[PDB]
Amino acid sequence: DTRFHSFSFYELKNVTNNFDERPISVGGNKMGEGGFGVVYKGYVNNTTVAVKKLAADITTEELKQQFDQEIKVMAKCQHENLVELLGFSSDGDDLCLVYVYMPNGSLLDRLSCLDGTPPLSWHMRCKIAQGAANGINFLHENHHIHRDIKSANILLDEAFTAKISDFGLARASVMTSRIVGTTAYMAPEALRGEITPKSDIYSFGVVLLEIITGLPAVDEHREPQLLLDIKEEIEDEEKTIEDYIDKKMNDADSTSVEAMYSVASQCLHEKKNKRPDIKKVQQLLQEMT
Amino acid sequence: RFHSFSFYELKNVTNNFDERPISVGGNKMGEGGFGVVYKGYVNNTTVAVKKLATTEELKQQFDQEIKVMAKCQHENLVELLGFSSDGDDLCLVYVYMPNGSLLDRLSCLDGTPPLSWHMRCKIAQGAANGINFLHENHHIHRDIKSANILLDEAFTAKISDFGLARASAQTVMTSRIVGTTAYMAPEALRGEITPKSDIYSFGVVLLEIITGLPAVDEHREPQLLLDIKEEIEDEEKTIEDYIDKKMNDADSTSVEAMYSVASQCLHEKKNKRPDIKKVQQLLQEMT
Amino acid sequence: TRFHSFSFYELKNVTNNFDERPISVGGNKMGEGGFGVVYKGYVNNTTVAVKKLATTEELKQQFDQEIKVMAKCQHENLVELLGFSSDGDDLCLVYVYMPNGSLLDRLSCLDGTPPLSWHMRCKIAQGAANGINFLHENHHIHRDIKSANILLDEAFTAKISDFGLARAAQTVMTSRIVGTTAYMAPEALRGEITPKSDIYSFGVVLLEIITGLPAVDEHREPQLLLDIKEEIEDEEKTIEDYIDKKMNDADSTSVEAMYSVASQCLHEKKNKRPDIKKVQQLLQEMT
Amino acid sequence: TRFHSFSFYELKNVTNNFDERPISVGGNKMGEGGFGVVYKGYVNNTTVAVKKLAATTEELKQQFDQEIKVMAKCQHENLVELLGFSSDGDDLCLVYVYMPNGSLLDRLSCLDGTPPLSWHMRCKIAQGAANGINFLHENHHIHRDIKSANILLDEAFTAKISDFGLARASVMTSRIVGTTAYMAPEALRGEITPKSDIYSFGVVLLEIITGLPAVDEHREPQLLLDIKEEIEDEEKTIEDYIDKKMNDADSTSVEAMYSVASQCLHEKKNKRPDIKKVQQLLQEMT
């Protein structure tokens, strides 16, 4: 149970060029953002870092609870397929969290080639899935449910080692009055209010589909708007997985693409008890390669 | 002017026209409605063989491609090396373009890295100079689109496909309406033939370059890239909202100067459109 | 007697009959020393490391010493013994599989692993220090501290390994001199047995961590990493000139605080060296 | 070909007044040679590399004019691109596109903690560097400074030949130039020939195979060229020198690459293969 560096908000304002909203590509500090905050590049003592400045559709005590949950899970869980918390800032109404800098950002941005990054090869997306399943396994082994498994939450280091991130919504492995997560990846029972490690498997199934097709889980200007719909089109023989494979690759083979699609379709069983456990998903991805 | 090849030579150099994609291990590199392009090797030289597939209409396009290629030679126009006319198998042999088409490079087909804003400007400028030479030599392309803008070893834009080219320099009509709907000018869709229609098709190409989106996508809202121009005109969206996210060097000043050229080109009214010398001047002023 | 008793034929099955091919080449061999070869194995869903040991009564004494020390000492920075196999002349030891192998191989990026960062190196060093402390607190002298013997788990937690040479601490002598020359204290090369020698070997490990260079390299000038300490002491070089270039997060303040600990550990005169609790305090003050 | 004419005061702004701190720390310095220091910069939203030339003054001016003249003629995907330059006063600057993966030298050594290149990537890099040198020899130019530090790598690890200040139109010289560790025997005594470039590329193939730089002061032997002699005299094999920092290397294509390198490193300049033959062999290897 690790202790983290306690930073003062002014130090984090200095290291992030006063939280420059300009993108890092242009010359600024902003690298990404979610509903709970904005991620900035920083330099703490020759160490390149990522500072997540938390900001408000949630309450102030709710955002504080997520900040305390992120810190509590980080203290417990340490793995190579889990991102590392370096420190934090809690002075005043400015909650900041400091992480190691991921040279390749998120799987979402790498699948979409954001900022002009080269398209991931099939072989690389295969290792990224294996890493993220090894990560999701350590969490489940240590009795934790992520509650927000998505490609934006899977980060890639210098070697492209998948490190799953965002533990503000994590639960100790029931129902809830505040339904949270990203609709495009959430399990049917999770959309109701159920909390179960089976929902994490479902969200990962949508992630395997994103990896295969290069398409994000939800696209407003796309037909169909949900990547899950494409699974129904394949099941009803209306389309095949070969028709959806990302054209931005040249090393994808049918045998391994259909083995990965098999894992994804098992993960996307609408009935929670029909889905495989994270150890079975991890076994299938290792057997695929 | 061009090497006369026999059909048997091209069947050997293209592995008997292997339909498998070059990425898999075959020869097929691309294809249109008039034929399929195959990779070939003619004595250590990599070449591209287009095997054409009305009968007399396809023969007229083969003769037009050769006739325009003999006349027009420019740095931004692709080079014809030879041809094969023996039998009912029409083949055309061109230099191998190491970077394929602008369409495939904007979509990163086969995993190629995304083009940067800087290269996208060089490509637009080159394609404008290429259209300019054609219009100067009294020719109307009639099929300007990103699939027809090829990229060499240095990413030099080289206009291709002159089977549909016409001799300019007023406005005439036709019974056989040809081209690609997603890029075609309103008057071209009606049957008019004018170099002004080429300017319109190039406006759609500048939009493809800015957004990374193909002119038509069945599974997209809106299905036509032209529709996005209307959304911007009616203040419903901006060009900044459509700029290709797969590039890190694009800036507002040059993206709005390129969008200005595209908006001028995309005039539904042909005589309001700029001439290719004015489009060429504007793209040069942008950089 | 607190570990799982395995039969030699179970371990033959779990290690693909002790496949000598490297794991990178599709086999089971992961590493090896002078006392045996380490193989990857699977005991159900748990990945394990089986060390197949290869004087006969001397090798048996090391097998019994490893098991006896492991039974007594249990710490987070000490590697865990799962089981063993003593049936016949085949002595096997089973441990938890360290996903990141040894500190030696990670500093050299063996098999293409990404270079360790200064932040990871700092935790590794503190962990190795915390591990040695538990051993010295429980009155044990490792006698073989080196980077090959510092293993790294799924989180890069340093786990000290190889206790076959461990002794039950005061200054005694031996007629059988054991250890690795490149790390051994002057008195330990002479036959002395003292926990002060372990501090010296750890000083060489701190130098390996700082520079990325192994303690001895035949094809290097100087062949001994210890020589580099003399060059720094005589102002002929600085520690900044030796810092591993395969890191981007190394800072002078911490690198000189770690070098200070290493310099204190590398005293030729054993009684001038700090105790493991003082080394542990200094590495805990560095960060 | 015309490049953008920058003023020295303009490039000073884009490079944070030529910050000597390394980019890893938070500064602008990315690398440096004997003829100048490379700085990261931003020209609009374009990330650039500004090479500020520094010491022979008329010799340094001749190299600046030679770099620009060759860049004007030669444009290829495996050749680095000149964006602009600054010649006002005694401060010659050259502006290029920013290479996200720096140089082949720094990637083979994992400078700044980059992951080791895999055998598959090392192969594509060798092929790219062969095609780039092929375009140069096709356009009648001799690089005269082929080395891994001068082979740059973009976002996709596309290799690009850089540094054309020493380039010649395809004789002897009174000013002998280049890097000793890669230079052909004839090049060390003034001869100027495109076969010397093939020799320097042979040393580059050896760097790619072993992960070792051509010259290391703190290494035995200090010259990578010596290791070729040890292999020729059966004293060592290429398997004994293959970079341990890769897990995807196989003996068959590693000995095929060593064959190309051994052919390039010939005693007799006329016995070495032409760049089209080297390019053919590197394509047959994969």
Ligand SMILES: CC(C)(O)[C@H](F)CNC(=O)c1cnc(Nc2ccc3ncsc3c2)cc1NC1CC1
């Ligand atoms: C390719 C490119 C632009 O160089 C690279 F992507 C830049 N690096 C990053 O974008 C990028 C770098 N480091 C990150 N670190 C990090 C680690 C853990 C964590 N947990 C919660 S927030 C968070 C952030 C995230 C990044 N991107 C994420 C999208 C925000």
Ligand SMILES: CC(C)(O)[C@H](F)CNC(=O)c1cnc(Nc2ccc3ncsc3c2)cc1NC1CC1
């Ligand atoms: C990136 C990659 C795969 O190496 C490269 F893209 C392969 N090259 C090509 O695809 C590709 C290569 N050469 C081409 N040459 C060419 C030149 C003129 C011409 N006029 C009419 S057809 C035609 C074809 C076209 C290519 N692609 C176009 C689709 C046909």
Ligand SMILES: CC(C)(O)[C@H](F)CNC(=O)c1cnc(Nc2ccc3ncsc3c2)cc1NC1CC1
């Ligand atoms: C990076 C990569 C290839 O995943 C990693 F290197 C694999 N891990 C291992 O090789 C590796 C994995 N587990 C080990 N476990 C272990 C635990 C205790 C112990 N006590 C005496 S021997 C011994 C071995 C050692 C490893 N390597 C050591 C060299 C033998």
Ligand SMILES: CC(C)(O)[C@H](F)CNC(=O)c1cnc(Nc2ccc3ncsc3c2)cc1NC1CC1
């Ligand atoms: C991996 C890391 C640190 O991100 C990357 F390496 C940073 N980029 C660069 O270092 C780096 C980036 N761009 C470069 N561009 C470039 C292009 C052509 C050219 N012709 C003469 S000098 C010169 C420089 C060189 C770089 N590095 C070379 C050592 C100077």
